[PDB]
Design a protein around this nucleic acid. Structure first.
Length: 63
DNA sequence: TTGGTTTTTCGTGCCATAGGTTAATGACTTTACAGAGGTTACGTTTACATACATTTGTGAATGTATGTACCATGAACGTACCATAATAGAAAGA
């Protein structure tokens, strides 16, 4: 959703081999998250860890 | 009157009687080689006490080992002198 700006950037770039500008042009796609926006990410982490632990608990020979 | 055959002495040559230095094998005798017999001072073999090493446990040096819970949201963070010409490349008008 941000490659249209990166194409116009790379049209100006004369094959820069320095990884610093390359790194801080690939990392600039995702913007800043909000303060309470990562709470839902943490809850999805909770749901994933709980699903893995339920999959372990349904295995009978783990005990 | 002169040359040459004949003849006799005489010192010289040949033969025989005497008598002495010195070769012979030996018998020497002296030196050298061959025979055993008592004595010396080592050279190899053996046992025994003590020593440096080398083999063990035990008290200290470091070293990775995982974490610390007000708030920390994009940049190079100071690099650098700018020579010269063979050979290609990506486009721009011929």
């Amino acid at each position: 959703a941000a490659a249209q700006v990166l194409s116009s950037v790379e049209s100006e770039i004369g094959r820069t081999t320095d990884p610093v500008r390359m790194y801080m042009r690939e990392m600039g796609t995702v913007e800043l998250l909000t303060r309470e926006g990562e709470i839902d990410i943490a809850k999805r982490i909770e749901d994933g860890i709980n699903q893995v632990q339920c999959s372990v608990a349904e295995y009978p020979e783990a005990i």
